[PDB]
């Protein structure tokens, strides 16, 4: 465009959106589980991914994925959200963090121990 | 800080000798002279042509593991050299050779750079009359570096200095073997310092 147009109009900024609406960019948020459930994924694959509906401190109610094998989640469990979507599961933009709250870690895991919250055995 | 553990995995890994043990590095029981193929049970299998980043990383790790230094100290010295006037690669090598643990190895007080680091860490080395305990001292030109008088019996350094006479020290260094003291005259040059590396690849690596 002409320089005079840039003088009048100017250039619009991009104004990026927030992928995670966890109350002004808080990294993690304490929440309580309401419904624990297994959910069928999208259709390039098939499994029984563990999903927990969590109502948290900001009054929001959102779903969350539970990584690892097995859990100890109930319909009344204080958990900590992590953030990070999962492709095969629509509506799930978050992750749960195993290791510190009512949600326990992973029993018998030795490779990636810092992830999934498992201590050093022996 | 210092990388501990096995050291022959390194000369075997980069495929070029690094001499990080000293007396054994001239013996026929040398790792490379015995087994030059890399370790880790996949050494006998042929190597696929590495990527450019792989070549840069291998030369960087090669040069870093020559002196046995941490990566955080390495990059800080690199950025100190580049943002300085002069050709960044040679002055980077000059700053790396100006290390205290390096110059005591270059003066031949020790046989290995790690042995040199252990010697300067125990206060067995002094500069201009004052004792120093750290291997990361920036040696300036004209510094009178010596071994402490209180640690002058020291059977190990006596046998090292005993085998030191007859050998020739580098051109930027001078040494009074009987008085057990060296002098750091000038900053080294790439021609004065033969290393099996290509510093330009390191410059290319950190410029990513």
């Amino acid at each position: 465009p002409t320089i005079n147009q840039l003088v009048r109009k100017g250039r619009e900024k991009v104004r990026k959106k927030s992928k995670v609406p966890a109350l002004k960019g808080a990294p993690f948020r304490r929440g309580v589980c309401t419904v624990v459930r297994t959910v069928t994924p999208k259709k390039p694959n098939s499994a029984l991914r563990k999903v927990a509906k969590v109502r948290l401190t900001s009054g929001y109610e959102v779903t969350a994925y539970i990584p690892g094998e097995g859990h100890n989640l109930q319909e009344h469990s204080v958990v900590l959200i992590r953030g990070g979507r999962v492709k095969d599961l629509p509506g799930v933009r978050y992750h749960i963090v195993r290791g510190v709250y009512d949600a326990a870690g992973v029993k018998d895991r030795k490779k990636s121990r810092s992830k999934y919250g498992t201590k050093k055995p022996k | 800080g210092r990388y501990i553990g096995p050291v022959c995995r390194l000369c075997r890994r980069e495929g070029v000798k690094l001499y990080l043990k000293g007396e054994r590095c001239y013996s026929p029981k040398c790792a490379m002279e015995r087994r030059p193929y890399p370790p880790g049970q996949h050494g006998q299998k042929r190597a696929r042509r590495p990527s450019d980043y792989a070549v840069r990383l291998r030369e960087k790790q090669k040069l870093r593991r020559i002196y046995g230094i941490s990566e955080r100290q390495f990059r800080n010295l690199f950025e100190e050299a580049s943002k300085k006037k002069g050709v960044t690669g040679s002055v980077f090598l000059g700053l790396l050779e100006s290390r205290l643990d390096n110059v005591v190895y270059r003066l031949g007080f020790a046989v290995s750079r790690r042995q040199a680091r252990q010697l300067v860490r125990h206060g067995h080395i002094t500069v201009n009359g004052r004792r120093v305990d750290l291997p990361s001292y920036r040696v300036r030109p004209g510094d009178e570096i010596a071994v402490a008088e209180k640690s002058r019996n020291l059977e190990l350094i006596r046998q090292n200095l005993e085998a030191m006479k007859g050998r020739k020290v580098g051109p930027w260094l001078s040494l009074d073997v009987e008085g057990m003291k060296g002098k750091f005259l000038r900053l080294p040059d790439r021609e004065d310092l033969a290393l099996p590396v290509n510093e330009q690849l390191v410059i290319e690596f950190y410029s990513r």
């Binding site: 069928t40 098939s46 499994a47 029984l48 | -």
Partner: protein, 84 residues
């Protein structure tokens, strides 16, 4: 949730017997899945087309499927060995 089998389904079930028990265990896995989740779960639940209208099919293998139907408190199984 009573089980209902056909003649060809059972004959093919016996065909699965004495040949390879892994397919048999996969069948039992699908049975308990459908007892828990009839229209969801593993095996990719999918209905059928023009001739087979009113039933459902699950992926046993990459080559074999399972045909079934569910009435209230009833589960009918047919064709455990065929290719659609």
């Amino acid at each position: 949730m009573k089980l209902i089998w056909s003649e060809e389904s059972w004959d093919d079930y016996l065909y699965w017997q004495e040949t390879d028990k892994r397919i048999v265990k996969k069948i039992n896995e699908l049975i308990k899945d459908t007892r828990r989740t009839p229209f969801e779960g593993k095996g990719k639940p999918e209905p059928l087309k023009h001739n087979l209208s009113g039933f459902w099919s699950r992926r046993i293998t990459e080559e074999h499927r399972l045909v079934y139907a569910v009435t209230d408190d009833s589960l009918l199984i047919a064709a455990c060995r065929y290719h659609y």
